Swiss-Prot record, chains A, B:
Protein name as it appears in the record: Dynamin-like GTPase OPA1, short form
Species assigned in the record: Homo sapiens (Human)
Function comment: Constitutes the soluble short form (S-OPA1) generated by cleavage by OMA1, which plays a central role in mitochondrial inner membrane fusion and cristae morphology. The transmembrane long form (L-OPA1) and the S-OPA1 form higher-order helical assemblies that coordinate the fusion of mitochondrial inner membranes. Inner membrane-anchored L-OPA1 molecules initiate membrane remodeling by recruiting soluble S-OPA1 to rapidly polymerize into a flexible cylindrical scaffold encaging the mitochondrial inner membrane.
Entry's localization field: Mitochondrion intermembrane space
Consequence the record notes for mutating residue 9 to A: In interface mutant 9; strongly decreased ability to mediate mitochondrial fusion
Signal peptide: none
Length: 51, 51
């Protein structure tokens, strides 16, 4: 119980730092996982094919 | 055997007519099924959220 409280606060702070870095570097972008990036990449490829 | 040959030619001609209609109406677009349209629609929604 004592350990998990400390870990939860540390994890929340760590996640906040990661989010702050994302905003500072990529404020106008959206975070996507590996699968979603693959879907976005293929759609762009199809657009270039049409263009 | 005789019937399937006639059907295959008719199906090919019918598909050609559908493709010709697609080009005449939507030359600069890509045909997608119901599922793919849902994926495209949600991505546009997320873009508007960011904008």
């Amino acid at each position: 119980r004592e350990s998990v409280e400390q870990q939860a606060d540390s994890f929340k702070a760590t996640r906040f730092n990661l989010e702050t870095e994302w905003k500072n570097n990529y404020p106008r972008l959206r975070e996507l996982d590996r699968n979603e990036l693959f879907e976005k990449a293929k759609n762009e490829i199809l657009d270039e094919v049409i263009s």
